[PDB]
C-alpha cells in the first residue's frame, strides 16, 4: 500500500495536472495559471503565522512573469518556497 | 484527505522526521535523504532502484553522503525522483 509520502507527492502530481491540463502542454502551467493555484489551493497568505511580506513579492513575482511556463519541478521549487514561507516549522525559527 | 496543504504538511513532517535525528534540524544529510527515499517511498524507489536516472540519483546521494540540503532541496529532489518514477510523466 501507499506511505504517507507517496501520497503526498501523487497529490502534488494530481494538483499539478488539475491546473497544467487547461492549455497547452499538459507538463507545463504558466506562471499566471500558478498563481491561480496559489490562490484556490492553499490556505491565506496573510497574517502574523506566515512571511506575509514574502509571499505577497512571490504572488507579484508570478504577475510579472504570467506567461512564463513551468515545468513540474519548478513548480515543486514555488511550493517549497511558499512552504517555507507558511509552515510554524519553519517561522517558528 | 486529498488537500494540497496536507500533501505539503506531509512533506515538511516527514522532512523532519529525519533532520530532527542529528545536528541542524534544518538540516539533514544526503545520505540520511537516501536512508528517507527507501524507508518512506518503498513502493516508487528501492531498496533497489530499475530506471538510469534513478540509479545515478541514488549513487550521487551515496558519493555525497556528508552533504546537507534544507527542505526547499530536499523537496526539489522529491520533484525530480517524481518525474522519473510517475506514470504521469513516464506515460507521455
Ligand atoms: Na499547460
Ligand atoms: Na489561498
Ligand atoms: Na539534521
Same mark, same amino acid.
Given at each position: 500500500?501507499?506511505?504517507?509520502? #507517496?501520497?503526498?507527492?501523487?497529490? =502534488? ?9 487547461? *492549455? +497547452?502542454? %499538459? ?8 498563481? #491561480?493555484?496559489?490562490?484556490?489551493? =492553499? ?9 506575509? *511580506? +514574502?509571499? %505577497? ?37
Amino acid at each position: 500500500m501507499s506511505s504517507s509520502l #507517496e501520497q503526498a507527492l501523487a497529490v =502534488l502530481v494530481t494538483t499539478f495536472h488539475k491546473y497544467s491540463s487547461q *492549455e +497547452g502542454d %499538459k507538463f507545463k502551467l504558466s506562471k499566471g495559471e500558478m498563481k #491561480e493555484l496559489l490562490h484556490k489551493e =492553499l490556505p491565506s497568505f496573510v497574517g502574523e503565522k506566515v512571511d506575509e *511580506e +514574502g509571499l %505577497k513579492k512571490l504572488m507579484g513575482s508570478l504577475d510579472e512573469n504570467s506567461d512564463q511556463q513551468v515545468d513540474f519541478q519548478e513548480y515543486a521549487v514555488f511550493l517549497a518556497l511558499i512552504t517555507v514561507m507558511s509552515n510554524d516549522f519553519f517561522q517558528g525559527s
